[PDB]
Amino acid sequence: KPRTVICVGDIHGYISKLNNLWLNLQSAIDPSDFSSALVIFLGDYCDRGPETRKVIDFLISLPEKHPDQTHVFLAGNHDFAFSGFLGLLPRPSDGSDLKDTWKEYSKSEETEGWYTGEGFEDMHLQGRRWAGKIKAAYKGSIYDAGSTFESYGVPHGSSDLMKAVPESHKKFLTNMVWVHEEDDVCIETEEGLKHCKLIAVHAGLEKGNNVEEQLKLLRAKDTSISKIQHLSGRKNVWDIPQELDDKHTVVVSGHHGKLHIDGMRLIIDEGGGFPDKPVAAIVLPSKKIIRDTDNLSS
Ligand SMILES: [Zn+2]
Numbered sequence: 001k002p003r004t005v006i007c008v009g010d011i012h013g014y015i016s017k018l019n020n021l022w023l024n025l026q027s028a029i030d031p032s033d034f035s036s037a038l039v040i041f042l043g044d045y046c047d048r049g050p051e052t053r054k055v056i057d058f059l060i061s062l063p064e065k066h067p068d069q070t071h072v073f074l075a076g077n078h079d080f081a082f083s084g085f086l087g088l089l090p091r092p093s094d095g096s097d098l099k100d101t102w103k104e105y106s107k108s109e110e111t112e113g114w115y116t117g118e119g120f121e122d123m124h125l126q127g128r129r130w131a132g133k134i135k136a137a138y139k140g141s142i143y144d145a146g147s148t149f150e151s152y153g154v155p156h157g158s159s160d161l162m163k164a165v166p167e168s169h170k171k172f173l174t175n176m177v178w179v180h181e182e183d184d185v186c187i188e189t190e191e192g193l194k195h196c197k198l199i200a201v202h203a204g205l206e207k208g209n210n211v212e213e214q215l216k217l218l219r220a221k222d223t224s225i226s227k228i229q230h231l232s233g234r235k236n237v238w239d240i241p242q243e244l245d246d247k248h249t250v251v252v253s254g255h256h257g258k259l260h261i262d263g264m265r266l267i268i269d270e271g272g273g274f275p276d277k278p279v280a281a282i283v284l285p286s287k288k289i290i291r292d293t294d295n296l297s298s
């Protein structure tokens with residue numbers, strides 16, 4: 001029997017959505033299949049929604065609750081920016097300063113009100129934007145980070161978040177991957193069951209540029225890039241690119257604020273961080289969509 005693969009879209013601090021989705025998944029999938037499933041969270045665990053702390057607590061609990069599952073946590077653009085603020089991102093491998101990432105978007109500083117508190121000088125651009133005070137709806141910053149700060153019991157933009165975030169949560173953020181590659185997954189197609197490679201990345205991959213070169217920077221967590229299109233892109237990362245569009249590679253993302261299935265391209269973000277939208281997961285091989293708003297039984 002083929003291994004069950006669960007890909008879960010953007011959570012954005014909605015603990016009730018996460019919990020209810022996890023509960024529904026256990027009625028959609030028989031216990032034997034669920035117990036040994038590969039579970040890929042597609043990123044964006046923080047911001048917009050009210051309970052980031054509880055979300056990360058829940059995600060930390062999963063290896064203990066389900067010891068035979070494999071858990072993969074993608075970094076979303078929101079989580080990258082959160083990690084940046086906490087100073088958890090490695091210094092750029094090319095020897096450049098984290099402050100060098102600011103220049104490209106320097107004109108945006110005033111309107112976005114970039115963070116200038118403790119440790120800002122050695123902070124990635126996205127960290128400063130994330131903890132910024134956007135000029136006046138946005139929750140504190142352009143990233144809606146206000147709700148993340150508040151879930152850890154501190155005011156928006158406060159350097160005290162660095163003390164308030166538990167060591168286990170910092171460890172969780174450090175353990176996030178920018179890309180996940182799986183050699184062999186099963187997926188139902190119109191022609192039947194196929195074995196495919198899987199690439200999971202928060203937003204997607206870029207056209208034109210060499211795919212392996214892109215994967216290299218994601219594997220290595222290249223922090224010299226001001227805005228990582230693989231985490232933050234839109235139209236430029238929507239399609240499966242040139243080298244991978246040969247029906248042997250599943251490319252799964254969240255990020256886009258849409259649930260969109262087009263053959264091997266799986267975009268799983270029905271929620272978009274909206275309080276009134278469901279969080280969806282896709283279950284492979286069947287490609288069935290499970291939502292927190294489902295009322296499933298076995
Ligand atoms: Zn998102």
Ligand SMILES: [Zn+2]
Nearest residue numbers: 044076077255
């Ligand atoms: Zn995103």
